[PDB]
Amino acid sequence: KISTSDPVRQYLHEIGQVPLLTLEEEVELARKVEEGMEAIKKLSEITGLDPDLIREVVRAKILGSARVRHIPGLKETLDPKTVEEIDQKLKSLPKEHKRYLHIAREGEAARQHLIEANLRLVVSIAKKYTGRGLSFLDLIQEGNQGLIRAVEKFEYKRRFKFSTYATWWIRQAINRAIADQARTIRIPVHMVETINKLSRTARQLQQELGREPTYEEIAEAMGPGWDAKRVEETLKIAQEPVSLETPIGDEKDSFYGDFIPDEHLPSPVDAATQSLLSEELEKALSKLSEREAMVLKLRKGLIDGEEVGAFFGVTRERIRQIENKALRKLKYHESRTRKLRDFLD
């Protein structure tokens, strides 16, 4: 039906069935997450296998079958055979290293468990960064990605709990997202705070003048290198685009796009131009000596815009010689049979 309510209920229901106790459960899972790492590493150590591979095989066995490996990540790990081979060596690890295997999985599990339980935390946080230009669901989701980030770095040895830790790692994720996706035309984080400061300033300036500040105040109040050109520029990028498709004129049935003209396209007038221009330029180009005419015809009209570098072996003296003597004989007979005079431009 309507999307927000369903997800809210979705994770709120599961947290409702499994919130993490303040100390115990967060500590428990945390402890397991870390041992997973310590395990995977020692696993890489005795298998010679990359910690990245040991991490993806334990993930597959705990989070999903061949199905989840085949669709998400295209196909380099053989759906069945590949991952299984890896699992076999893990079994061969006697009593000592087998332990790490059993640990890695359970840790991976806790990771997931710790992640589930702390989903209300995200939503509660994400709840406040709402009207920034992102969908609540989008916001919660980015924030969610933030919590997963926190899970990777929390050190349970350092007594502080996951609550305060997740807050930061999430708030970071969200704000970034807000700055990265909110607009149609991307604007880096610095420009963003820049714009917030600009805005906040204009607010304090609105406070007493009764005059929506000329871009003079804004420069002053802002700080060190702020000038009119800078503020007019910033607020110009601050305005989001307009809907090329918006209700126009009297709102009846007016779509903002039949009125803008087109530039690349040669309006008939121009197609006729290029025809005579090229046919006449082509006639002249032929009645001349190739040596320096083509040089300047091709150097100017074929690639890019170098007198010396223009002619092949023959130096500058013959260039200027024929260039200026052929160009003038060409212009003065063209003066006789006036074809080009009526400036095609």
Next chain:
Amino acid sequence: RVEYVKKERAGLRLPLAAWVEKEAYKPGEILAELPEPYLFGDKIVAAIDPEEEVIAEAEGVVHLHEPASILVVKARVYPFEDDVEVSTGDRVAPGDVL
């Protein structure tokens, strides 16, 4: 499957408290741990520890609640090896194919 335990009396629980009271994990003293009638698996003192901690110095702790979470699943302790289909479950103690 129960979880954490406080300090009424300690008996039959997992390795957690083992290291705490060094008597049993340092040497074989868990039998003498039973105080005064032994003159006339886990069995600890009459009642001396009350935390979900590690005892270097009572540092890595967590005083709290003890859960009793009933898992409706069938627990197997000594499965055996029958090779008709690929070895299912487990061996006595050595091999664990599961």
